[PDB]
Scaffold this active site. Structure first.
Site, PDB file in Angstrom:
ATOM      1  N   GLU A 112      69.954  19.237  12.945  1.00 34.89           N
ATOM      2  CA  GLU A 112      69.756  20.704  12.959  1.00 34.89           C
ATOM      3  C   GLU A 112      69.707  21.171  11.426  1.00 34.89           C
ATOM      4  O   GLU A 112      70.606  20.806  10.896  1.00 34.89           O
ATOM      5  CB  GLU A 112      70.889  21.514  13.728  1.00 34.89           C
ATOM      6  CG  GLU A 112      70.535  22.968  13.620  1.00 34.89           C
ATOM      7  CD  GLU A 112      71.173  23.735  14.439  1.00 34.89           C
ATOM      8  OE1 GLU A 112      71.817  23.508  15.695  1.00 34.89           O
ATOM      9  OE2 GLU A 112      70.958  25.084  14.214  1.00 34.89           O
ATOM     10  N   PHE A 135      80.281  35.563  16.724  1.00 36.34           N
ATOM     11  CA  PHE A 135      79.278  35.010  17.233  1.00 36.34           C
ATOM     12  C   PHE A 135      79.491  33.515  17.726  1.00 36.34           C
ATOM     13  O   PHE A 135      78.420  33.062  18.486  1.00 36.34           O
ATOM     14  CB  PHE A 135      77.894  35.109  16.355  1.00 36.34           C
ATOM     15  CG  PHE A 135      76.803  34.961  17.160  1.00 36.34           C
ATOM     16  CD1 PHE A 135      76.110  35.954  17.830  1.00 36.34           C
ATOM     17  CD2 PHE A 135      76.231  33.780  16.854  1.00 36.34           C
ATOM     18  CE1 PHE A 135      75.195  35.625  18.445  1.00 36.34           C
ATOM     19  CE2 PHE A 135      74.748  33.613  17.530  1.00 36.34           C
ATOM     20  CZ  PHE A 135      74.306  34.767  18.128  1.00 36.34           C
ATOM     21  N   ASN A 172      81.112  34.206   6.785  1.00 33.89           N
ATOM     22  CA  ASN A 172      81.377  33.694   8.463  1.00 33.89           C
ATOM     23  C   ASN A 172      80.790  34.704   9.456  1.00 33.89           C
ATOM     24  O   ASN A 172      80.141  35.631   8.831  1.00 33.89           O
ATOM     25  CB  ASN A 172      82.760  33.597   8.758  1.00 33.89           C
ATOM     26  CG  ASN A 172      83.427  35.194   8.907  1.00 33.89           C
ATOM     27  OD1 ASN A 172      82.984  35.947   9.813  1.00 33.89           O
ATOM     28  ND2 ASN A 172      83.954  35.593   7.764  1.00 33.89           N
ATOM     29  N   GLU A 201      66.630  23.625  16.201  1.00 35.06           N
ATOM     30  CA  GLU A 201      66.403  24.475  15.271  1.00 35.06           C
ATOM     31  C   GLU A 201      66.186  23.892  14.215  1.00 35.06           C
ATOM     32  O   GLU A 201      67.043  23.970  13.129  1.00 35.06           O
ATOM     33  CB  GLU A 201      67.540  25.485  15.141  1.00 35.06           C
ATOM     34  CG  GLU A 201      67.454  26.378  16.697  1.00 35.06           C
ATOM     35  CD  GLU A 201      68.786  27.422  16.382  1.00 35.06           C
ATOM     36  OE1 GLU A 201      69.937  27.039  16.598  1.00 35.06           O
ATOM     37  OE2 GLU A 201      68.442  28.469  17.071  1.00 35.06           O
ATOM     38  N   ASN A 242      80.430  32.451  23.052  1.00 28.45           N
ATOM     39  CA  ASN A 242      79.360  32.804  23.804  1.00 28.45           C
ATOM     40  C   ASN A 242      79.412  32.204  25.300  1.00 28.45           C
ATOM     41  O   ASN A 242      78.248  31.946  25.833  1.00 28.45           O
ATOM     42  CB  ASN A 242      78.040  32.157  23.183  1.00 28.45           C
ATOM     43  CG  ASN A 242      77.848  32.551  21.888  1.00 28.45           C
ATOM     44  OD1 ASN A 242      77.065  31.876  21.145  1.00 28.45           O
ATOM     45  ND2 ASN A 242      78.218  33.789  21.251  1.00 28.45           N
ATOM     46  N   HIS A 263      74.725  20.051  20.056  1.00 25.93           N
ATOM     47  CA  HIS A 263      73.242  19.589  19.934  1.00 25.93           C
ATOM     48  C   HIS A 263      73.377  18.337  18.964  1.00 25.93           C
ATOM     49  O   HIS A 263      73.238  18.110  17.807  1.00 25.93           O
ATOM     50  CB  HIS A 263      72.553  20.608  18.930  1.00 25.93           C
ATOM     51  CG  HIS A 263      72.570  22.072  19.353  1.00 25.93           C
ATOM     52  ND1 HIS A 263      71.755  22.371  20.352  1.00 25.93           N
ATOM     53  CD2 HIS A 263      73.142  23.198  19.057  1.00 25.93           C
ATOM     54  CE1 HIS A 263      71.962  23.744  20.444  1.00 25.93           C
ATOM     55  NE2 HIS A 263      72.714  24.349  19.802  1.00 25.93           N
ATOM     56  N   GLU A 301      67.812  27.220  26.190  1.00 24.17           N
ATOM     57  CA  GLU A 301      68.942  28.219  26.164  1.00 24.17           C
ATOM     58  C   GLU A 301      68.249  29.411  26.635  1.00 24.17           C
ATOM     59  O   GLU A 301      67.147  29.940  26.322  1.00 24.17           O
ATOM     60  CB  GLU A 301      69.273  28.447  24.855  1.00 24.17           C
ATOM     61  CG  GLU A 301      69.953  27.242  23.835  1.00 24.17           C
ATOM     62  CD  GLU A 301      69.942  27.453  22.218  1.00 24.17           C
ATOM     63  OE1 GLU A 301      69.535  26.811  21.535  1.00 24.17           O
ATOM     64  OE2 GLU A 301      70.842  28.356  21.941  1.00 24.17           O
ATOM     65  N   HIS A 318      68.993  24.474  10.642  1.00 21.67           N
ATOM     66  CA  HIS A 318      68.495  25.835  10.766  1.00 21.67           C
ATOM     67  C   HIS A 318      68.692  26.641   9.495  1.00 21.67           C
ATOM     68  O   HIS A 318      67.717  27.655   9.252  1.00 21.67           O
ATOM     69  CB  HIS A 318      69.390  26.488  11.902  1.00 21.67           C
ATOM     70  CG  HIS A 318      69.116  27.644  12.478  1.00 21.67           C
ATOM     71  ND1 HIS A 318      69.693  28.244  13.731  1.00 21.67           N
ATOM     72  CD2 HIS A 318      68.008  28.697  12.245  1.00 21.67           C
ATOM     73  CE1 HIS A 318      69.122  29.195  14.048  1.00 21.67           C
ATOM     74  NE2 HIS A 318      68.356  29.497  13.414  1.00 21.67           N
ATOM     75  N   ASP A 366      75.528  25.933  15.184  1.00 22.29           N
ATOM     76  CA  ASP A 366      76.175  27.263  15.324  1.00 22.29           C
ATOM     77  C   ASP A 366      77.520  26.868  15.861  1.00 22.29           C
ATOM     78  O   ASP A 366      77.768  27.070  17.005  1.00 22.29           O
ATOM     79  CB  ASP A 366      75.265  28.113  15.931  1.00 22.29           C
ATOM     80  CG  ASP A 366      75.869  29.390  16.386  1.00 22.29           C
ATOM     81  OD1 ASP A 366      76.919  29.682  15.550  1.00 22.29           O
ATOM     82  OD2 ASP A 366      75.295  30.224  17.097  1.00 22.29           O
ATOM     83  N   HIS A 423      79.419  22.742  24.327  1.00 16.72           N
ATOM     84  CA  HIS A 423      79.670  21.868  22.897  1.00 16.72           C
ATOM     85  C   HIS A 423      80.882  21.375  23.311  1.00 16.72           C
ATOM     86  O   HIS A 423      81.529  21.526  24.368  1.00 16.72           O
ATOM     87  CB  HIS A 423      80.085  23.118  21.983  1.00 16.72           C
ATOM     88  CG  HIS A 423      79.084  23.425  21.103  1.00 16.72           C
ATOM     89  ND1 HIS A 423      78.643  22.466  20.109  1.00 16.72           N
ATOM     90  CD2 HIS A 423      78.311  24.384  20.973  1.00 16.72           C
ATOM     91  CE1 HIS A 423      77.687  23.055  19.437  1.00 16.72           C
ATOM     92  NE2 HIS A 423      77.309  24.374  19.949  1.00 16.72           N
TER      93      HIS A 423
HETATM   94  C1  2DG Z   1      70.370  28.650  20.551  1.00 19.08           C
HETATM   95  C2  2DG Z   1      71.298  27.716  19.560  1.00 19.08           C
HETATM   96  C3  2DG Z   1      72.844  27.600  19.738  1.00 19.08           C
HETATM   97  O1  2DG Z   1      73.351  26.687  18.957  1.00 19.08           O
HETATM   98  C4  2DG Z   1      73.249  28.990  19.405  1.00 19.08           C
HETATM   99  O2  2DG Z   1      72.987  29.385  18.098  1.00 19.08           O
HETATM  100  C5  2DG Z   1      72.585  30.190  20.288  1.00 19.08           C
HETATM  101  C6  2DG Z   1      72.834  31.569  19.924  1.00 19.08           C
HETATM  102  O3  2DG Z   1      74.333  31.384  19.889  1.00 19.08           O
HETATM  103  O4  2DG Z   1      70.998  30.045  20.359  1.00 19.08           O
HETATM  104 MG    MG Z   2      71.248  26.976  15.111  1.00 19.79          MG
HETATM  105 MG    MG Z   3      79.580  38.385   7.557  1.00 17.51          MG
HETATM  106 NA    NA Z   4      76.458  31.500  18.808  1.00 16.26          NA
END
Ligand code: 2DG
Ligand code: MG
Ligand code: MG
Ligand code: NA
Ligand code: MG
Ligand code: MG
Ligand code: MG
Ligand code: MG
Ligand code: MG
Ligand code: NA
Ligand code: NA
Ligand code: NA
Ligand code: NA
Lengths: 1011, 204
Positions: free
Chosen positions: A404, A589, A585, A449, A592, A379, A525, A406, A189, A345
């Site tokens: 990952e 998000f 996209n 994930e 954070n 990650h 998390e 996901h 993410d 990150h």
């Molecule tokens: C846990 C995993 C992290 O990479 C983000 O996706 C987070 C939500 O923003 O969740």
């Molecule tokens: Mg993810």
């Molecule tokens: Mg969209």
């Molecule tokens: Na995020």
């Protein structure tokens, strides 16, 4: 061969992975970690050209520079130089899901460098090139001849260039693929970028060399004796005269040393390892390593002959510490940890995913300064310097494999497939091989994930086998599978269960005691810090302290992944998902964090700092009890400052030395306090101050604080009666009140205070009206989108109930005169399509003293969604320089995020009263305020407020902070009640019931007057 | 109750009495109660009450009003939680509806007498010619709080003249996790510092 569409080929001709080498040829240099002439950097100006696909690359490029290439800096991410767009997508893969294939239009970065190699490097020995990070796959050629290929964007790829170079100039050519089968395992993410984004170097090693070395430290029961075990491996020709010497230093003192010839003990029926040796050194009373006190030793590994000639030396910092799980608890040096963690990150607003030492140091200092003691490498394995800084500054690290997936359906589709075991395996084994000697790493993670597949179980075991020294965790498939030694959920709530099928998220308290469960629980998390968030943070901390097996968590996350863009005027602005033309996209998000991309803190960081304090306090009488939460150190750099103030007026203060052993208590008695001059509430504030500077803080740093209410003497003194009485004037259209230089105008058709004057100056730009909504926070919006409405989100419920569209209907507006005042009474109903949502009943009483007392009683229909707020608002005519108040502060604070705030008198420039979240929303509230001063106005009572140049309407209509424009005047939002902001997660309602405005009836009172 | 202020104003369709009192002990002010009583041409008396409680005094058992009515009526009819006695931390079993019981059922005969018979979440109470409306908790019986605390056995209580009415804006929980240490949970202690409540007293 299209090796990039085959998970069976993750590399070609790559060298084995191993701990950081430098091949020093001088041992003293190796001892002190000084630069090695044998490890050269190739970073700087390289030649680069971009192509839409590998098929478009010209063959000329292998042998000769392309004239069209540009010169750019390396390391870098090509998106950051503008060659193509970076993409921000959370779960959905940025490429069609059709493993192991990738698109035919696959952005290809052609990098090359002409560089010199001295003959001395070529006459003897081995010259290898090391690419610390190339995203996502690449082919390498040297002087036109193909050398090899590599995948896994977050580990170093090394190749022997010995037979390919020549003295003097040489030319490398690196063809880097943006997408590859490795991309299927890189669905984190974050922004999707590519390029040669970590260091490039050249290392010379002798032909007979140290090819690997592993350091272990084992202890006696009380940790007063250890044995340092160093297993050393060589490549090259064995000869009886070879030896290895391992020496251990503490600073400038040599603590121990041992030498032996090669030849390991017998392992099986075929013998032992003739090419390895293990040295064992006793260390008495070792100084132990911890994040509290990062004591380090230096192990120096020398390969040499018996007659004394050194062949080469390698080395590492060593931290004597044991990590183990026992009886359900994670222990460090035999004591149970309390992880004050954060996920982090590698992100830089200008350089993308390129990391530098300055940024790393800045993050670590802020982290420590804010009471964090641990970091999760979300990650993927990080740039190698990160580990060295964590070792030396002291932070616990969870090192995590770059795996990952996901976006797969179901999430374990690849991880349960044996054909993907090899590729996954390299991402876990190569990490362990490189990072296993760092004391800061305390736990290994199998990735993030990717569901739970049998590849996880095999890899979990491999680790357990090779390195029994650290526990293994992994959250996929339910957070408590057989592939994790620690229950490590993401977003599990404190008390509330979320029983999703298959992978429920149980309340953390309840999770620990499920039948048969005995592991420790540490959230991988939690407390999603997106935008105005961290509501309910204190509830986690209270639970972590009360339950032994709740050993903390890693907040999600450290820094916003915003990127800088430039406008037409060249002014920079913070951008997020979709701002680069990237689609699909996930918009904001990617933001954070507790800090903005430039490291400026958001307001939530202070909440984390307070809740993560290492000293706990209780008050009985005038006796303060200080308890230390440190496990190893005494409070040897701390003093307690205390101060008592009456309504913000300082009455007394003192300082007392803190002398508390780890886990101990100290009792401090405060001095007798003289009686306060007048009525009011006495408040005690205590602060732990560190008088001396440390490697991570300045002298004077405040590490902990707490407050309590002391005695209160309610005011019973009658107010000196006015020498004047206000005059009412009734007109069809308005009720006006005059008192001296003041005048109040109430419109009879709207039933609101439409204007006020001081002298000949109008005070209002918009009338004083009830307000029951807020410009939605990220947490109010959740996953809701205009195209994909999430009807469960708070924003949607409010919208659907018509809260944002409700119109006030006047039910009543009357005026009465009293013996000393004028009384205006109103009543309004806000309705929506026939429904009465709220009813506001008020009285305004203006007296001879000039004060306007406003009394408000609101009724909220029980069946309407609980409102965001209950208060009044108006646009004042004035713009003033300062905001002064008596209440909680100084920073922004909300009901479920106000513990860090302190009740006192604060004064800030108005701009500090606005929090510039990248995605704009309601912001800047301050709660528990009894007096607010601005311009000539003063308001008194017990309310929450915000004041700024941006209306709620503008905030809710604006997607990026840079587009906001100050309005005329100043928007004041004064609330009797405000809803919590939540944050347990940002994609489902998370405001706990106790912070929702569900009471049905609400009452508040404000007095407005001149200052 | 030291009197701080007592005024009267005549309005358009009513008479407004304003009062303020301070309760003190040894010179310490424990609580301050500020009220307005608005009597209109309809004959209804609206009482608004704003109380302040010192942060440093022990949270009080209740925040309400009381009086001894001359009247003794046979029934008690209310719209609120019931029918049985209920307290803030013990009212989940009670249901909101219109209840009507004989007076004596509004008293709970605990062998060792104490505050008892409270009914919470009440919006309307009827007794004799009187009607009170608001959002309050209340108890009503022939025994004063004073008599209950001074009497050690229920058989010794005697009905007083008239009827004692205790109407509360707020009442502390009763607790019970144990009976030998403080057991009322934080959320049921009256620690808010400022409390507001309002009631309308009318006849019929
Ligand atoms: C846990 C995993 C992290 O990479 C983000 O996706 C987070 C939500 O923003 O969740
Ligand atoms: Mg993810
Ligand atoms: Mg969209
Ligand atoms: Na995020
Ligand atoms: Mg491949
Ligand atoms: Mg030299
Ligand atoms: Mg040449
Ligand atoms: Mg506090
Ligand atoms: Mg119920
Ligand atoms: Na704990
Ligand atoms: Na000290
Ligand atoms: Na917005
Ligand atoms: Na009694």
């Amino acid at each position: 061969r299209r090796d990039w569409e085959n998970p069976g080929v993750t590399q070609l001709n790559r060298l084995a992975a191993h701990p950081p080498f430098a091949s020093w040829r001088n041992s003293e240099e190796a001892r002190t970690d000084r630069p090695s002439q044998q490890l050269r950097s190739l970073n700087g100006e390289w030649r680069f050209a971009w192509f839409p696909a590998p098929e478009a690359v010209p063959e000329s490029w292998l042998e000769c520079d392309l004239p069209e290439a540009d010169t750019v800096v390396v390391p870098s991410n090509w998106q950051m130089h503008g060659y193509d767009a970076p993409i921000y997508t959370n779960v959905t893969y940025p490429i069609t899901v059709n493993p192991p294939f990738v698109p035919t239009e696959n952005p290809t970065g052609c990098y090359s460098l002409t560089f010199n190699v001295d003959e001395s490097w070529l006459q003897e020995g081995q010259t290898r090139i090391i690419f610390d990070g190339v995203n996502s796959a690449f082919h390498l050629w040297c002087n036109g001849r193909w050398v090899g290929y590599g995948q896994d964007s977050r580990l170093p790829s090394e190749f022997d260039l010995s037979a390919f170079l020549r003295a003097g100039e040489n030319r490398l050519a690196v063809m880097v693929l943006r997408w590859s089968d490795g991309s299927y395992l890189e669905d984190q993410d974050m922004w999707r970028m590519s390029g040669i984004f970590r260091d490039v170097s050249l290392l010379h090693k002798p032909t007979t060399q140290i090819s690997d070395f592993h350091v272990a430290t084992r202890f006696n029961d009380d940790f007063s004796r250890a044995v340092l075990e160093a297993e050393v491996q060589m490549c090259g020709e064995l000869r009886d005269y070879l030896r290895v010497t391992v020496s251990l230093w503490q600073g400038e003192t040599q603590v121990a040393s041992g030498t032996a010839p090669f030849g390991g003990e017998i392992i099986d029926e075929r013998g032992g390892y003739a090419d390895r040796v293990t040295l064992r050194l006793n260390v008495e009373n070792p100084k132990l390593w911890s994040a509290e006190i990062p004591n380090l030793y230096r192990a120096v590994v020398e390969l040499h002959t018996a007659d004394g000639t050194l062949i080469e030396a390698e080395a590492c910092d060593v931290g004597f510490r044991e990590v183990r799980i026992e009886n359900g608890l994670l222990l460090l040096n035999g004591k149970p940890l309390l992880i004050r963690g954060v996920n982090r990150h590698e992100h830089h607003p200008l350089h993308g995913q390129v990391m530098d030492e300055q940024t790393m140091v800045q993050d670590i200092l802020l982290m420590k300064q804010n009471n964090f003691n641990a970091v999760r490498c979300s990650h993927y394995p990080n740039h190698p310097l990160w580990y060295t800084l964590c070792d030396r500054y002291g932070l616990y690290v969870v090192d995590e494999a770059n795996i990952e997936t996901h976006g797969m359906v179901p999430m374990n589709r690849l991880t349960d497939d044996p054909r993907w075991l090899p590729a996954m395996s390299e991402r876990v084994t190569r990490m362990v091989q490189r990072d296993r000697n760092h004391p800061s790493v305390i736990i290994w993670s199998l990735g993030n994930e990717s569901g739970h597949g049998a590849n996880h179980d095999a890899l979990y075991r491999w680790i357990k086998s090779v390195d029994p020294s650290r526990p293994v965790q992994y959250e996929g498939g339910g957070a408590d599978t057989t592939a994790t030694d620690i229950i490590c959920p993401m977003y599990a709530r404190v008390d509330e269960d979320q029983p999703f099928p298959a992978v429920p998220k149980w309340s953390i308290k309840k999770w620990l005691s499920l039948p048969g469960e005995t592991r420790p629980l540490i959230l991988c998390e939690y407390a999603h810090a997106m935008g105005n968030s961290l509501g309910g943070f204190a509830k986690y901390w209270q639970a972590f302290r009360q339950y032994p097996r709740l050993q903390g968590g890693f907040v999600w996350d450290w820094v916003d992944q915003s990127l800088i863009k430039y406008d037409e005027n060249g002014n920079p602005w913070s951008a997020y998902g979709g701002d680069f033309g990237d689609t699909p996209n996930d918009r904001q998000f990617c933001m954070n964090g507790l800090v903005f991309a430039d490291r400026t803190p958001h307001p939530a960081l202070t909440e984390a700092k307070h809740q993560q304090q290492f000293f706990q306090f209780r008050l009985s009488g005038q006796t303060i009890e200080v308890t230390s939460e440190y496990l190893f150190r005494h409070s040897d750099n701390e003093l307690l400052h205390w101060m008592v103030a009456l309504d913000g007026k300082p009455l007394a203060s003192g300082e007392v030395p803190l002398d508390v052993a780890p886990q101990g208590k100290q009792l401090i008695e405060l001095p007798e306090l003289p009686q306060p001059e007048s009525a009011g509430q006495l408040w005690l504030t205590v602060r732990v101050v560190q008088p001396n500077a440390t490697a991570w803080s300045e002298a004077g740093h405040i590490s902990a604080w707490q407050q309590w209410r002391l005695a209160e003497n309610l005011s019973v003194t009658l107010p000196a009666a006015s020498h004047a009485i206000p005059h009412l004037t009734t007109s069809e259209m308005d009720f006006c009140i005059e008192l001296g230089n003041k005048r109040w105008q109430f419109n009879r058709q709207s039933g609101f205070l439409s204007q006020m004057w001081i002298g000949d100056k109008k005070q209002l730009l918009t009338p004083l009206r009830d307000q029951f909504t807020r410009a939605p926070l990220d947490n109010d919006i959740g996953v809701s989108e205009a195209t994909r409405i999430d009807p469960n989100a708070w924003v949607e419920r409010w919208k659907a109930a018509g809260h944002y569209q409700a119109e006030a209907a006047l039910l009543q507006c009357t005026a009465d005169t009293l013996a000393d005042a004028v009384l205006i009474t109103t009543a309004h109903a806000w309705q929506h399509q026939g429904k009465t949502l709220f009813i506001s009943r008020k009285t305004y009483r203006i007296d001879g003293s000039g004060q306007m007392a406003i009394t408000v009683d609101v009724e909220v229909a029980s069946d309407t969604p609980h409102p965001a707020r209950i208060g009044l608002n108006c646009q004042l005519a004035q713009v003033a320089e300062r905001v002064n108040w008596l209440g909680l502060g100084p920073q922004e604070n909300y009901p479920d995020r106000l513990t860090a705030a302190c009740f006192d008198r604060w004064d800030l420039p108005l701009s500090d009263m606005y929090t510039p979240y990248v995605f704009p929303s309601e912001n800047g509230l301050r709660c528990g305020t009894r007096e607010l001063n601005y311009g000539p106005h003063q308001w008194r009572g017990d309310f929450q407020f915000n004041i700024s140049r941006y209306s709620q309407q503008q905030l809710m209509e604006t997607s990026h902070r840079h587009l906001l424009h100050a309005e005329e005047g100043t928007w004041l939002n004064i609330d009797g009640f405000h809803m919590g902001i939540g944050g347990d997660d940002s994609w489902s309602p998370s405001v706990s019931a106790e912070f929702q405005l569900s009471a049905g009836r609400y009452h508040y009172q404000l007095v407005w007057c001149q200052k």
